[PDB]
Amino acid sequence: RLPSADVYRFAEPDSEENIIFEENMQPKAGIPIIKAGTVIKLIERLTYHMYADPNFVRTFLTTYRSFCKPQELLSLIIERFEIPEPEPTEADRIAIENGDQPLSAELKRFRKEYIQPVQLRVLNVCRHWVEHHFYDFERDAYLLQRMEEFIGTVRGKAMKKWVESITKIIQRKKIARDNGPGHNITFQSSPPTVEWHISRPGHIETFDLLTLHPIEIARQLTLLESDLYRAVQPSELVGSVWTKEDKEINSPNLLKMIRHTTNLTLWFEKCIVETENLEERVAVVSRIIEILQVFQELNNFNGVLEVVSAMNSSPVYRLDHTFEQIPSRQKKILEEAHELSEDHYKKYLAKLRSINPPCVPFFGIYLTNILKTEEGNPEVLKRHGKELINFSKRRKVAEITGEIQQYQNQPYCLRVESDIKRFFENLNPMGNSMEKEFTDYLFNKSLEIEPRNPKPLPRFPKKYSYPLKSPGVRPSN
């Protein structure tokens, strides 16, 4: 029936030396769930003759980079396509030598019941690859040449529509190379006016924390973070690519999210500790809590928990004389914001699963859970002396990426202000410093502005030449 191992590797039999399945679920579901296997066995079951497996295709193509390179994958699926057909029977040879057509009964069967199935499943994998994962081919024009040489040498009536589907996707993605962004945008309620404060509209030189409006700070950062959140692809997280040695190649949108998070959070800390006058620093902290209010009103959980991160920082959290003068209202607001994180993020996930769109989810819990998954599961399971790729680990990370992805569909009914947007895109509080040494700077600055117990607090001069009373978090209705 099936071909032999000396001509075709994807016809080696299943064993505990080559595949492990999950026994959780599946009491003869038809399709088993692979816990682990060799890459050959994974590719085989990705392109199986008995069944299509679209959930495995998606999960595989999101994650394969943790176990297999693009060029290796393309070689493997092409090898899977190249099935050896059987030789004729002795009677069919006799028919051929007589000048007649052979009956060809097993060959006709094997084509219909093995080859065609596997080959159409290979094309299904290729089609999913060029649609949802085209960045591999954007990063590798030789990979694209190989794919297009493959797809354009496929022969057969049965393969025609798949080849045409794949090539239309490849051509459409080639247009995307020079096109880029556009306006789409699911937005439904009426948007507000842009709110303005000490900064006169367009006078970018004047823009600061206390001079832009706190509602508008929150709304433009929410617009920004919504776009940053929505730009991260699933595959950028698998293997923790942001902490591999090709991060700035292969985590482009992910590092932009991470760096924004760092720059805004350290900018809040910087704003606080470099205001050495206590009374001004209360105004700073109070304004950041008002930005947190508007983040809470917008359901930008990412912006809430960035302020939580700044206020719980070593430099800021010890500034007891500042927080003593923050009113009980704003203290309750920070307490409730901290409570989002308490008990493993219990209140966060309960709130997130009960609010209505739009939102920006907190991004850093997903990174944390992916790292816990990465550090807590082996890359290979050992069986019988052989090492099998832990695909259950990859499925676990892929599941977490889908919990991100379900919220990437929901932009805001907020008006963009392009100068405030560009201002916040260009935050760099550290400058030429690095994070650790900058936060040690900020901690030393904290100890300057509020010294420790038996050294009394000195009086420092003002730095703001402008009114420090906020306009408030209520809009100009």
Ligand SMILES: Cc1c([C@@H](C)Nc2nc3c(c4cc(=O)n(C5CCOCC5)cc24)CNCC3)cccc1C(F)(F)F
């Ligand atoms: C509420 C607040 C906060 C918020 C954001 N922090 C915190 N708020 C609560 C609890 C916390 C426990 C804790 O272990 N941490 C630490 C986390 C690791 O980093 C070092 C701090 C921080 C906490 C316990 N439950 C009650 C609410 C920051 C500054 C000023 C104020 C205000 F009270 F003045 F408003």
